[PDB]
Ligand binder design. Structure first.
Ligand SMILES: [Zn+2]
Lengths: 97, 96, 252, 258
C-alpha cells in the first residue's frame, strides 16, 4: 500500500491514523464494555442462544432496523441442540421412552 | 486458551507498537479477572477468543453469534464467567 | 537569574516560550479574567518539547467546549478539535503558516519527519494552511500519547503583576481540570459550568474529581497532577528574548 | 528512507537464506572470512568498493561497528568465527540469563492467570462430554487422563527443555525488530543505532543489519543476518510447542522422547 501510494499519490496522515490506532482502539472498546454497570432484571442465561442472538441483533442494529425484524441469519449450534445416548445393558433409550 | 493468554500478555507488555499507552496496560493488568475475560469472551461479541467449542467437532458451525452465546452460557454454568458478564455483553453500546 | 542555567534548560525555555507565543493562550486567559520576527528561535529550539507543549496548549484551549459538548475519549477529542480547526480558521494557524514558510524551518520539519514527503507534494511557499494543519495533527497525537504515558507537562505563567499571574494560573488549572474530566470519560455527569466564574468552576470541578476518586481510587489510571508551572516576574516575550540573547552570547 | 507509522518489520522468515549476504557481512567489517563460495563475485565487488570508498549508507553503518568491537573486546584477533550450518548445534540451545528478565515476568503472569481457571475448564469439558454421550451405567468422565491433564498445561510448558532458548531468542528478535522499526518511524534525536549487552560469559551486539554473539569461555563467534534470527527463533519456538504438546497428549508421549 505504501509503495503504490508513493507511485500514484493520494495518501494522507489522517487516513493511515485509522490503521495505526487499530489495536489500541480494540482494547479501548473492550475496556469500555467490561466496566459497564448492569442490573439483574432480565435472566439472559436462562434463554436459548438463538433468542439471545435475535435480541442482541435487535439491540445493536436499532439505529437502522428500528423495531423491524431481521430474518435469515440464526441457526442452532450443534453442541446445544444434540443429546447423545449410548444404548447398552438391555435398557431402553431414556429420551425415546 | 493458554496460548491466547500468553499472546495477550505479550501484545500488552512486550510489543513494538508505540500506540499502546500505560493506562490501558495497567488497567488490564490490575483490574481483577480482566485478562481472563479478554481471553475467554468470544470474538464475535467483543472478546479475543476465536475458537468455538463446537468447532472442535464440525468445521461449519452456522453463524458465529449463536455459537458465541452458547459458549458464554456454557462458561457461566462452569463458573468460568459470571452472569454480569453476559448482562454487560447484552447491554454494550452499538457501533455506527 | 539565568546564570545558573545550562544549555538544555535555556533551549527548553525557548521552545516552551515559542509554543506559548504561537498559540495565544495568555490573551485567552486574560479574556477568561475579563512579533513578526519569529525565525531565529524556530531555527534554535527543540522540536519534541515544542510539539508536546503545542499539543497541550491546543487541547487546553478547547477544554471548555469539550466539556460543554459531552465528548469523551482521546479519539473523539482529536476528531472534534481537528474538525473545528479545519472548518473555522484561526489566527494561530496563520502565524504557524507564516513561520513555516521560511525555507530553513521547512527543511528542519522536513528532516525531522513531521512533513512527510508521501502525504503530499509540499515545498517552501507551496502551501501554508495544510502544513500548519499537519503540524497540529501530529502535535495533538504526540501530546495525548505523552500524557497517557505519565509524562508531565510544563508551561510558563509570566506577568509583571503577581495577582494577574496567579489568576492566569488558576484559569489554566480550571481548563486543565476540565480537559482531564473529558479525557477520563467521566464528563457526562459533570455539573453544568455555563455562565459561571472560574473560581467556582475550579472548586466544583475539583470536588467532582475528588468524588470520582472516592468511588474508584484510580479513575481508569489517567494522570492528574502532571502540570509543572514556573512563574517569572517578567513577561513571556521578554523571557524569550532574554533566553535567546543568552543563547547568542554563549555562541550556540 | 520512507517514514510511516504502519510499516512493521518482518516477524517470520519469508525469504530464502543466501550465503552471499553472510559472506558480505563478514567482508565488510574486517573479520576473518570462514565461508568458501562457488562464485565469490560479491566479495570482490565489496573489496573494490571498500578500496575506492564507495560503500552505501547501510554498508557504512555496518562498517563503523568495527571501532566499537575493537574498543570493547581487547583480544579480538584470537576468536574463531563459525559458518552458518556448523553453528546450528550451539544456536539451537542458546541461553543468556542476563537479557531475558522481561519476558519471564510476563510469562509468569500468564501462568498465574491460566492457573486460576483449570477447575472451570475441567468442569466445562466434563459437562460437555456427559451431555454429548450419556451412558446409564457408570462411565464417570472425571477420571480421564486427557481431562486430568488440563491442570498441568502451564506447568508442562514452563518445565520444558526448550523454554530458555526460546526466551533468549524471543528477546533478541524483539530488540532487533525494535531497532528496525525505529529506523522507519519519526525520530527527533539521532543516537546509537545498536544495542550492546555485556556478560561475564557472553557478548551480544544487536544491529538492524546483524547480530554478533561472542562466547569467551571457548572464544567462538557467530555473525548472523536478520533472516537467521527469525529462522532460529521460530525453529526453537516450534520445538518448544512440539515438545510440550506431545508431553501433554497421552497418544504422543512416545513421540515426545522419540
Ligand atoms: Zn433414542
Amino acid at each position: 500500500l505504501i509503495r503504490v501510494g508513493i507511485n500514484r499519490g493520494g495518501l494522507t496522515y489522517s487516513l493511515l491514523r485509522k490503521i495505526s490506532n487499530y489495536d489500541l482502539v480494540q482494547y479501548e472498546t473492550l475496556s469500555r464494555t467490561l466496566r459497564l454497570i448492569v442490573s439483574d432484571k432480565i435472566r439472559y442465561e436462562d434463554m436459548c442462544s438463538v433468542d439471545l442472538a435475535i435480541a442482541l441483533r435487535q439491540k445493536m442494529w436499532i439505529h437502522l432496523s428500528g423495531g423491524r425484524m431481521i430474518s435469515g441469519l440464526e441457526t442452532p449450534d450443534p453442541l446445544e441442540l444434540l443429546s447423545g445416548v449410548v444404548i447398552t445393558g438391555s435398557e431402553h433409550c431414556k429420551i425415546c421412552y | 486458551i493458554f496460548k491466547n493468554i500468553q499472546q495477550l500478555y505479550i501484545a500488552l507488555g512486550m510489543n513494538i507498537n508505540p500506540t499502546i499507552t500505560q493506562n490501558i496496560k495497567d488497567q488490564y493488568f490490575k483490574n481483577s479477572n480482566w485478562m481472563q475475560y479478554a481471553s475467554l469472551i468470544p470474538a464475535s461479541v467483543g472478546g479475543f477468543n476465536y475458537m468455538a467449542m463446537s468447532r472442535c467437532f464440525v468445521r461449519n458451525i452456522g453463524d458465529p453469534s449463536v455459537a458465541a452465546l452458547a459458549d458464554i452460557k456454557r462458561f457461566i454454568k462452569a463458573n468460568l464467567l459470571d452472569r454480569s458478564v453476559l448482562y454487560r455483553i447484552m447491554n454494550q453500546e452499538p457501533g455506527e | 537569574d539565568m546564570n545558573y542555567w545550562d544549555d538544555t534548560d535555556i533551549i527548553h525555555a525557548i521552545s516552551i516560550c515559542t509554543a506559548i507565543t504561537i498559540a495565544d493562550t495568555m490573551s485567552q486567559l486574560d479574556r477568561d479574567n475579563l512579533i513578526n520576527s519569529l525565525i531565529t528561535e524556530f531555527l534554535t529550539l527543540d522540536i519534541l518539547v515544542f510539539l508536546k507543549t503545542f499539543g497541550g496548549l491546543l487541547v487546553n484551549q478547547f477544554a471548555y467546549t469539550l466539556y460543554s459538548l459531552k465528548i469523551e475519549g482521546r479519539d473523539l477529542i482529536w476528531d472534534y478539535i481537528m474538525r473545528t480547526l479545519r472548518d473555522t480558521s484561526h489566527s494561530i494557524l496563520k502565524v504557524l503558516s507564516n513561520a513555516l514558510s521560511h525555507p530553513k524551518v521547512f527543511k528542519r520539519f522536513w528532516d525531522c519527519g513531521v512533513l512527510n514527503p508521501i502525504y503530499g507534494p509540499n515545498t517552501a511557499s507551496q502551501d501554508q494552511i495544510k502544513l500548519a494543519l499537519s503540524i497540529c495533527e501530529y502535535a495533538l497525537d504526540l501530546f495525548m500519547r505523552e500524557w497517557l504515558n505519565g509524562v508531565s507537562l510544563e508551561i510558563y505563567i509570566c506577568d509583571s503583576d503577581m495577582e494577574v499571574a496567579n489568576d492566569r494560573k488558576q484559569a489554566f488549572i480550571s481548563r486543565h481540570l476540565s480537559f482531564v474530566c473529558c479525557l477520563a470519560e467521566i464528563a457526562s455527569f459533570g455539573p453544568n459550568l455555563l455562565n459561571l466564574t472560574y473560581l467556582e468552576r475550579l472548586d466544583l470541578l475539583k470536588q467532582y474529581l475528588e468524588l470520582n476518586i472516592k468511588e474508584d481510587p484510580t479513575l481508569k489510571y489517567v494522570q492528574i497532577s502532571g502540570l509543572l508551572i514556573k512563574s517569572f516576574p517578567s513577561t513571556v516575550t521578554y523571557v524569550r528574548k532574554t533566553a535567546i540573547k543568552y543563547l547568542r552570547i554563549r555562541g550556540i | 528512507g520512507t517514514v510511516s507509522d504502519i510499516l512493521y518489520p518482518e516477524c517470520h522468515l519469508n525469504s530464502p537464506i543466501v550465503k552471499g549476504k553472510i559472506a558480505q557481512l563478514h567482508t565488510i567489517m574486517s573479520l576473518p572470512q570462514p565461508y568458501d563460495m562457488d562464485d565469490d563475485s560479491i566479495l570482490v565487488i565489496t573489496r573494490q568498493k571498500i578500496k575506492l570508498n564507495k560503500l552505501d549508507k547501510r554498508q557504512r553503518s555496518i562498517r563503523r561497528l568495527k571501532l566499537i568491537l575493537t574498543e570493547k573486546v581487547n583480544d579480538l584477533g584470537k576468536y574463531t568465527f563459525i559458518r552458518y550450518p556448523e553453528m546450528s548445534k550451539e544456536m539451537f540451545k542458546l541461553y543468556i540469563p542476563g537479557i531475558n528478565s522481561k519476558v519471564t515476568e510476563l510469562l509468569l503472569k500468564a501462568d498465574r492467570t491460566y492457573s486460576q481457571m483449570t477447575d472451570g475448564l475441567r468442569d466445562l469439558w466434563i459437562n460437555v462430554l456427559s451431555k454429548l454421550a450419556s451412558k446409564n451405567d457408570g462411565s464417570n468422565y472425571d477420571l480421564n487422563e486427557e481431562i486430568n491433564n488440563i491442570s498441568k498445561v502451564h506447568t508442562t510448558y514452563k518445565s520444558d527443555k526448550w523454554y530458555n532458548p526460546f526466551k533468549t531468542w524471543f528477546t533478541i528478535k524483539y530488540d532487533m525488530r525494535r531497532l528496525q522499526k525505529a529506523r522507519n518511524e519519526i525520530t527527533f534525536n539521532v543516537g546509537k543505532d545498536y544495542n550492546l549487552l555485556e556478560d561475564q560469559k557472553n557478548f551480544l551486539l544487536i544491529h538492524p543489519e546483524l547480530v554478533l554473539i561472542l562466547d569467551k569461555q571457548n572464544y567462538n563467534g557467530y555473525l548472523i543476518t536478520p533472516e537467521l534470527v527469525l529462522m532460529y527463533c521460530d525453529v526453537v519456538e516450534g520445538r518448544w510447542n512440539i515438545s510440550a504438546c506431545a508431553k501433554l497428549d497421552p497418544k504422543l508421549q512416545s513421540m515426545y522422547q522419540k
